[PDB]
Design the sequence.
């Protein structure tokens, strides 16, 4: 049976939490469990599509280096907090959200007026704090879908169109996968006693299902390997 | 003659003057880059003290280009950033601009 | 390359408006303009949008600002 | 002689890049050579990269 | 406000080329363009400065049609009950007042319209006073020569542009040459090539 | 904050004027990114005064070496404070500890 | 778009001898070249069937 290779398949999706998860692939022959697995890691940390905040707009704020009356944190601190916000966008690749708040207390992500197609993974994520009773904050958040990391300097050098004063630009981190750990262990099937199985532990931001990530990584790897298969 | 800060600057496009306000100072919080005009200044030269011609020839083909020469402060080359604070200091006896 | 690609075969597996039915008071226009629209025999925005502008000021209790506002919001909504 | 002065403050957000001087508290200094991708750095058993 | 308009109307060097009526109409059009720029909508209006009376006011042009787009200039063909319209098409109103004339856009459009009116008026009275000369021989001196059209100067702010189409295939006006030439046609319709002098 | 320190960071941060230090104990009546208004305690009341003190934190002010100086509030609304405590952290300061 | 990825176009083959060969792939996404090279090297080293 040296000529033919056994076909691996997904066998278990152990969802530890909303973010941490484990995926089991079985069976894998000899060093394959390393090789393919390694590739998956190197695909998962750089080529995973995701939704990230690109532009912010505050009615009472004209530049990110200023401060707003009634908020404890700086405008730059608010932008930095918004950078880590994780949302899931379905239907399109461009969403505008409105955040209206008034009164003393924190401003959680749940205060964002959801549009139905867009989902907030962490409603309790904090953004800012209003320490004044008669303090109102109105904010427009622009979120897009992409890959990799796109710095704001790239956007300003692209200069597609002139932006009005008060449209703050934040760095985009489209990658939703934060940690990947692959392990290869022995597998018992048909008394072969030589096949191995691969366990991939993924710690993400929760906006992408681990099985979908594995499928996308496999598809990307196959698309890349198609050119090698052709060989001109 | 004394120089004054004004929005009107000779032979500059409207795009350059867009960043400036009516007074002649770039808006706070406006992104600027090398070559942009943060504040528009003009110095009298050659001849002056002829206001009827200035009013009549404000855009005629003579344009009094030699009368006032541009001396506006420009962002140094290779320097980019966002304007965050503007301060105006005026000596006593001189009319204060609106920004002050 | 063929072996590596076929190892991923089992894994790739890849290749009339709602505002119109609402009353005319939902046109974000002034209450006086809403009364003007009601006096126009147009209680729903659907009739106003479907039909060409008519009787914009022939109805009673008209004011200039409301006359402008009703048509302005009708054009702005674009329903 | 001068009757007016205008001062403008410009804020620049400088990020890290190769060539910047970095160092610790024990006199060990150096310059950044390459902004390596996250998937290139070595990782431990748990998969956390350095 | 008003003192400025009297100052700019009394400082015109070419008072013959800019009488009060046409320059004030140009100012009215410039203020109409300024009001167009001020509002997010596009509404054509008229000013009627009231030159000799006093300060100015603003009007509004409706352009009665059945369209719905651009609501600021839309009026139904039958909406003439109140506001003293009493007509089918062409009704105008005196609604909008207190238009700001001290702004970047307002000043720019005012000066641009003023200089454009200067050019149009000078062209009009260099074509009106030289239209009867058609069919007669008039000399001139060239100033600019190009591969498609060349320019000639006659006198008293007179400029003529002659094109290659006006050139006969065999006869040409050499650069730097002045000579009496018959005036074939005079075209006030086209601002360019006002004096179509040829041979 | 430095994970490994010498314990002298607090002294350096407090002695320097970069961070705001409460002159008198009390409670934070009003906390904001711009200003902090503190109502002092009954024990530490100076006679014949309202009893509140206001600290205006410097924000994004150019230093001698063209570096931003930022003071960020540390306490929250209703948190009791005492004399010598840090109310707002200065540049390169975390929780009253110097962090370069 | 997002699903689109760069594909090599300047696939050059140089035949040093009947067995020695050089293959040049141009261009590739940042980091993809390392993955492809390592995977191909491991597969060729420890997985190619043959008779010996």
Sequence:
């Amino acid at each position: 049976s040296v000529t033919e290779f056994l076909k691996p398949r997904l066998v278990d999706i152990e969802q530890v939490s909303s973010t941490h998860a484990k995926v089991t692939l079985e069976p894998l022959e000899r060093g394959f469990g390393h090789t393919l697995g390694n590739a998956l890691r190197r695909i998962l940390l750089s080529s995973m599509p995701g939704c990230a905040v690109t532009e912010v707009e505050i009615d009472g704020v004209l530049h990110e280096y200023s401060t707003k009356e009634g908020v404890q944190e700086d405008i730059l601190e608010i932008l930095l907090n918004l950078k880590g916000l994780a949302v899931r966008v379905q239907g399109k690749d461009e969403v505008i959200l409105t955040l209206n708040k008034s009164g003393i207390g924190p401003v959680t992500a749940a205060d964002i007026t959801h549009d139905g197609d867009v989902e907030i993974v962490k409603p309790q994520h904090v953004i800012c704090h209003l320490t004044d009773e008669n303090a109102s904050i109105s904010m427009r958040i622009k979120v897009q879908r992409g890959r990799g990391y796109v710095p704001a300097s790239t956007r300003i050098h692209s200069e597609e169109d002139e932006r009005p004063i008060g449209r703050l630009l934040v760095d985009a981190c489209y990658s939703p996968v934060e940690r990947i750990a692959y392990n290869v262990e022995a597998a018992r099937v048909e008394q072969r006693t030589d096949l191995d199985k691969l366990v991939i532990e993924m710690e993400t931001n929760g906006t992408i299902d681990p099985e979908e990530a594995i499928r996308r990584a496999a598809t990307i790897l196959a698309e890349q390997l198609e050119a090698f298969v052709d060989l001109r | 003659g004394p120089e004054e800060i004004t929005a009107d600057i000779p032979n500059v496009g409207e795009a350059a003057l867009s960043k400036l306000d009516e007074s002649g100072i770039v808006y706070i919080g406006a992104e600027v880059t090398g070559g942009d005009i943060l504040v528009g200044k003009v110095t009298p030269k050659g001849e002056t003290q002829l206001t009827p011609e200035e009013k009549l020839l404000r855009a005629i083909f003579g344009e009094k280009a030699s009368d006032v020469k541009d001396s506006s402060l420009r962002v140094p080359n290779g320097v980019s950033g966002t304007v965050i604070d503007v301060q105006v200091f005026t000596r006593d006896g001189v009319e204060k601009d609106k920004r002050a | 390359a063929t072996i590596l690609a076929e190892q991923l075969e089992a894994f790739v597996d890849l290749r009339f408006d709602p505002i119109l039915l609402r009353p005319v008071d939902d046109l974000e226009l002034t209450v006086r303009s809403a009364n003007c629209l009601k006096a126009e025999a147009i209680h729903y925005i659907g009739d106003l949008v479907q039909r060409t502008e008519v009787e914009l000021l022939k109805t009673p209790n008209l004011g200039k600002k409301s006359l402008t506002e009703i048509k302005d919001v009708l054009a702005s909504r674009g329903l | 002689g001068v009757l007016k002065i205008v001062k403008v403050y410009l804020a620049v957000k400088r990020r890290i890049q190769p060539g910047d001087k970095m160092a610790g508290r024990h006199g060990n200094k150096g310059v950044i050579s390459k902004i390596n991708p996250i998937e290139d750095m070595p990782y431990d058993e748990n998969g956390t990269p350095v | 406000m008003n003192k400025e308009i009297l100052a700019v109307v009394e400082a015109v060097s070419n008072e013959k080329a800019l009488p009060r009526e046409k320059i004030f109409e140009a100012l009215e059009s410039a203020l109409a363009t300024a009001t167009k720029k001020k509002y997010e909508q596009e509404i054509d209006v008229r000013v009627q400065i009231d030159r000799k009376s006093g300060d100015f006011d603003t009007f509004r042009r409706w352009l009665v049609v059945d369209e719905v787009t651009q609501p600021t200039k839309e009026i139904t063909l039958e909406a003439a009950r109140y506001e003293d319209e009493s007509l089918n098409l062409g009704d105008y109103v005196e609604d909008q007042i207190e238009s700001v004339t001290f702004d970047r856009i307002t000043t720019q459009t005012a000066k641009q319209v003023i200089v454009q009116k200067v050019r149009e008026a000078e062209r009009a009275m260099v074509v009106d006073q030289f239209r009867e000369h058609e069919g007669e021989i008039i000399t001139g001196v060239v100033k600019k020569v190009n591969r498609d059209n060349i320019s000639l100067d006659l006198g008293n702010n007179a400029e003529a542009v002659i094109l290659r189409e006006d050139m006969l295939p065999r006869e040409n006006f050499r650069p730097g040459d002045r000579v009496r030439g018959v005036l074939y046609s005079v075209r006030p319709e086209a601002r360019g090539a006002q004096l179509f002098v040829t041979r | 904050k430095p994970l490994v320190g010498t314990g002298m960071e607090r002294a350096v941060a407090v002695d320097s004027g970069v961070t705001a230090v409460a002159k008198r104990g009390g409670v934070v009546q009003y906390v904001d990114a711009s200003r902090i208004v503190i109502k002092v305690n009954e024990d530490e009341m100076y006679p014949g005064e309202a009893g509140i003190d206001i600290y205006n934190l410097t924000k994004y002010t150019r230093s001698n070496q063209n570096t931003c100086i930022n003071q960020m509030p540390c306490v929250s609304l209703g948190e009791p404070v005492e004399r010598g405590d840090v109310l707002a952290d200065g540049p390169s300061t975390d929780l009253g500890e110097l962090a370069l």
User: Anything to note?
Assistant: The interface with chain A takes residues 11, 15, 37-39, 43, 45-48 of chain D (CB under 8 Å). Strands of chain D lie at 4-11, 21-23, 29-31. The CA atoms of residues 10 and 16 of chain D lie 19 Å apart. DSSP finds no helices and three strands in chain D.
